[PDB]
Design a protein around this ligand. Structure first.
Ligand code: GLU
Length: 297
């Protein structure tokens, strides 16, 4: 068998269940691939691991993938393009969640000054968005009381224990980590003003407005106006066309099966959307798949 490891994120985010379900589905297709998901810090770690030859595929944010491919915009990639990544599919929106304890004196992003904040994991996309958003509100990590980098499960535990005041997570709606925190702890979601971000859209062009419906998380009954990017499935350029083509048919050829993997896929995924506005080139095997499917002409 040909072994594929799919980098993901924290076990209580959305990448990890999605990657796990993708891996199972391609294994079940009996196409000579043996796939597994791996938990990681998220997008930056995942791209680095593809480039290093450690992972064959991963989930990543569209913004981070662009920055990697261009060698720009964030410190992790500035100065050295990562041209070894290719797109397979745009998947679903990843929303910037800014979670605050209700007792912490936080109603806006500006209130994070002096607070203990989980800014994202080491190697996360989340941290990059947090840094950009804080600067749009006139803050740096140094203005925080503590800038904490940990996994989603560690981060929610800190907020449960009142060892953190707030937590950022760029993640699909309905992440277990967030759901679990809302069940135990009085929390709110802090708004992120797109227009304040928009002042920085020249530099960071992938933010879109996104409104988290009220009642998504327990006790959070009001809507939350924030911003989103897009989750993507990416792959090494070094994977053969034939391997990627077979993978694509096994995973995306099976649309009902694919959408069962996570509610975000059922809600948001579609084949036409999968190829729209991509930040990096498609893998040849994906191009072939989408051409046959009639999605690319
Ligand atoms: N987009 C997040 C991870 C989201 C998830 O694990 O679902 C990141 O790159 O850090």
């Amino acid at each position: 068998q040909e072994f594929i490891t799919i980098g993901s994120g924290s076990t209580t985010g959305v990448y990890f269940p999605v990657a796990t379900g993708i891996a199972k589905l391609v294994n079940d297709a009996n196409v000579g691939i043996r796939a597994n998901a791996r938990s990681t810090g998220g997008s930056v770690a995942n791209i680095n691991a593809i480039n290093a030859g450690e992972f064959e595929m991963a989930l990543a944010q569209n913004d981070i993938a662009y920055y990697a491919y261009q060698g720009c915009c964030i410190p992790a990639f500035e100065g050295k393009p990562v041209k070894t990544i290719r797109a397979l599919a745009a998947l679903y929106p990843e929303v910037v969640h800014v979670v605050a304890r209700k007792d912490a004196g936080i109603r806006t992003v500006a209130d994070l000054k002096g607070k203990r904040v989980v800014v994202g994991d080491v190697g996360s996309g989340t941290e990059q968005n947090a840094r950009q958003i804080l600067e749009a509100y006139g803050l740096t990590f140094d203005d925080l009381g503590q800038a904490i980098r940990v996994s989603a499960s560690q981060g929610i535990q800190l907020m449960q224990d009142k060892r953190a005041d707030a937590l950022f997570y760029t993640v699909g709606l309905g992440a277990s980590a967030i759901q679990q925190l809302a069940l135990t702890t009085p929390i709110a979601l802090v708004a992120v003003d797109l227009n304040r971000i928009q002042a920085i859209a020249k530099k960071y062009p992938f933010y879109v407005g996104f409104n988290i419906p009220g009642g998504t998380y327990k006790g959070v009954d009001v809507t939350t106006p924030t911003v989103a990017v897009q989750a993507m499935l990416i792959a090494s350029e070094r994977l053969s066309e034939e391997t990627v083509y077979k993978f694509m048919k096994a995973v995306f050829g099976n649309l009902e099966a694919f959408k069962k993997i996570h509610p975000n896929l059922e809600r948001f995924f579609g084949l036409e959307k999968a190829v729209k506005g991509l930040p990096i080139p498609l893998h040849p095997g994906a191009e072939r798949f989408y051409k046959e499917a009639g999605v690319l002409k």
